[PDB]
């Protein structure tokens, strides 16, 4: 995945 950080 990409930057899935909230």
């Amino acid at each position, epitope marked *: *995945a*990409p*930057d*899935v*950080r909230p």
Partner: single-chain antibody
Amino acid sequence: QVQLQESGGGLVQPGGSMKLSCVASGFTFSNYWMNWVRQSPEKGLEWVAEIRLKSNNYATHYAESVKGRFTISRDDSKSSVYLQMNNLRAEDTGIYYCTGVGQFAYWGQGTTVTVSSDIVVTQESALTTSPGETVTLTCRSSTGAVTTSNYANWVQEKPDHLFTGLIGGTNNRAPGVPARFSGSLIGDKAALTITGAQTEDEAIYFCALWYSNHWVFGGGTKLTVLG
């Protein structure tokens, strides 16, 4: 207000070099990957590079078009991201934006550079709606069906080249984005729905799809809001 303040553009000769800067405020810069994206008349919106976190040893990835010539870096102690551009060519001409977070919520204001698996993502060229209507934009991949593994993003461009992210991760509304915007997957395309279009929503909408280790942007949809 998040701000991403860019500098460093100009007017350069084929074969020259230039370094762009972008300084972040209003969010925890060092927790998020950062990207450079450029806009040209010739090639629409094009993702250029990403850098991940200190915990990833600041790992980088580049579009094939710039690999070997461009270098992305960051300085977490100054909340800044940079793009060193070597061996510039006519085709590198355009407006350069630093952007990130969820995954393209926040865009810098842009800095102009004037130099003097071949995936296509397809959006409707234009759509026309009226205030109060429900309108759906779509985003198709040449590779087959769009899935949640393409982490579809939607971004809005308003006059003079002002970008804001609406949706990331298929259907997550970026912070403070109006409730009338939503993201979906509908018949193997990604979709943005405006439920009750407003006059101010007249704009160009872009989608971006992730393929393992890079982004591809669609050509954008010009939405006109009449009446």
